[PDB]
Amino acid sequence: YKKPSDAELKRTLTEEQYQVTQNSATEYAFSHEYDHLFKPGIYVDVVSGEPLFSSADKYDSGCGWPSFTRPIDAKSVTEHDDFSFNMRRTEVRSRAADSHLGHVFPDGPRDKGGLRYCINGASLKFIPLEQMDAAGYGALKGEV
Ligand SMILES: C[As](C)(=O)[O-]
Numbered sequence: 366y367k368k369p370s371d372a373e374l375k376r377t378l379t380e381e382q383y384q385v386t387q388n389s390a391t392e393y394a395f396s397h398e399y400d401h402l403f404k405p406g407i408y409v410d411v412v413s414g415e416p417l418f419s420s421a422d423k424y425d426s427g428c429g430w431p432s433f434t435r436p437i438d439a440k441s442v443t444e445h446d447d448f449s450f451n452m453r454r455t456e457v458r459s460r461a462a463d464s465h466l467g468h469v470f471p472d473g474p475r476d477k478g479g480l481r482y483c484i485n486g487a488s489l490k491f492i493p494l495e496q497m498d499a500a501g502y503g504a505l506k507g508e509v
Pocket of ligand 1: 391430466467468483
């Protein structure tokens with residue numbers, strides 16, 4: 366899982382996908398299809414295809430963006446202090462392509478770890494269970 370050149374990205378990603386993953390922009394709350402999508406499968410980095418979240422950990426937090434209790438693999442994402450626009454939050458970015466994904470907060474389901482990963486649907490690509498094998502993610506079916 367690798368990240369193409371900035372120049373190549375400009376010609377493959379939509380304006381929205383590019384602004385969110387490359388410039389850390391934020392999609393309008395409740396605007397993405399993935400917000401209310403709850404079907405079996407996984408969500409991968411729109412840029413590199415790296416698996417990031419599983420349908421197994423997706424839940425309704427009412428925050429406005431796809432929400433998960435944890436990443437599909439602890440190593441899949443990286444955390445960063447975000448002192449953007451007068452406040453302190455923890456930014457979440459993908460490991461391989463370093464795409465801006467969203468933020469994580471300490472107010473998630475307590476029995477699931479207590480974390481809430483709020484992610485832009487524009488930074489993801491959903492792979493339904495029925496297509497995971499063909500897509501090359503067969504080994505991850507155990508995570509749904
Ligand atoms: C707008 As957000 C999904 O980075 O808390």
